[PDB]
Amino acid sequence: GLMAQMATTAAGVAVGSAVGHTLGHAITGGFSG
Amino acid sequence: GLMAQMATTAAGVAVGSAVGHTLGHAITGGFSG
Amino acid sequence: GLMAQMATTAAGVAVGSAVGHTLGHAITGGFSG
Amino acid sequence: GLMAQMATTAAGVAVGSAVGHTLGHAITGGFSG
Amino acid sequence: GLMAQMATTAAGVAVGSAVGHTLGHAITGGFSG
Amino acid sequence: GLMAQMATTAAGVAVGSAVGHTLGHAITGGFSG
């Protein structure tokens, strides 16, 4: 599926393998004034 | 599925393998003034 | 499923393997003034 | 410094604000066979 | 410094604000056979 | 400094604001057979 070999010295965010998914109905609110 | 081999020295956030998912109905509120 | 081999020296947050999911109906409140 | 306002429904890993740092001497071992 | 306003429904990894830094001497091992 | 307003429905990795830096001496190992 997902494979990662990572060598990092400094990182704000370090991620090897990651999945995000929505099935069905998903609603994300936006930005309003 | 998900495999990660990570070598890191400094990280704000370090994650090997991660999954986030919604099934069915998901509503996220936004930002309003 | 999820496998992680991580070597880290300093991390704000270090996570090997993690899953978060919602099934059915999920509502997250947003930010309002 | 670091400020975060996050609305999330499902996440493997959810982090608002995070710092990781090394001062001086830091050695991270790698992967060998 | 760092500011984030994030609305997300599904994420493998969700991070608002993050810093990773090394000061001085940092050595990260690599991958060898 | 860094500001982010992000609306996302599905993401493998979602990051608002992030900084990674090395000061001084940093060595990252590579990949060898």
Author numbering:
A (entry chain G), B (entry chain E), C (entry chain F), D (entry chain B), E (entry chain A), F (entry chain C): 54 to 86
Quote the authors verbatim:
Mitochondrial proteins CHCHD10 and CHCHD2 are mutated in rare cases of heritable FTD, ALS and PD and aggregate in tissues affected by these diseases. Here, we demonstrate that the low complexity N-terminal domains of both D10 and D2, as well as the full-length proteins, can form amyloid fibrils in vitro and in vivo. Structures of D10 and D2 fibrils assembled in vitro from the low complexity N-terminal domains of each protein show that their core comprises the most highly conserved region between the two proteins. For D10 and D2, the central conserved VAV motif forms a beta-strand that is associated with the protofilament interface in all the structures we have observed, suggesting that it may be a critical element in fibril formation and may be expected to appear in ex vivo structures as well.
We also determined the structure of D2-NT amyloid fibrils to 2.03 Å resolution, which again contains two identical PFs related by a helical symmetry axis. The core ordered region of each D2-NT PF consists of D2 residues G54–G86. A sequence alignment of D10 and D2 shows that this region corresponds to residues G43–G75 of D10 and features only 5 sequence differences between the two proteins. Therefore, the core ordered regions of D2-NT and D10-NT fibrils are formed by highly homologous regions within each protein. While the D2-NT PF fold differs from those of all three D10-NT PFs, certain elements are conserved. The D2 PF fold contains three strands consisting of residues L55–T61, V66–V68, and S70–T81. Strand-1 adopts a very similar conformation to that observed in the D10-NT PF1 structure, as do the last five residues of strand-3, and the two strands pack together in a nearly identical manner in both structures, with residue F73(D10)/F84(D2) packing against the equivalent Q47(D10)/Q58(D2) residue. In addition to this, strand-2 of the D2-NT is superposable on the corresponding VAV sequence of all three D10-NT PFs and forms the central part of the PF interface both in the D2-NT structure and in D10-NT polymorph-1.
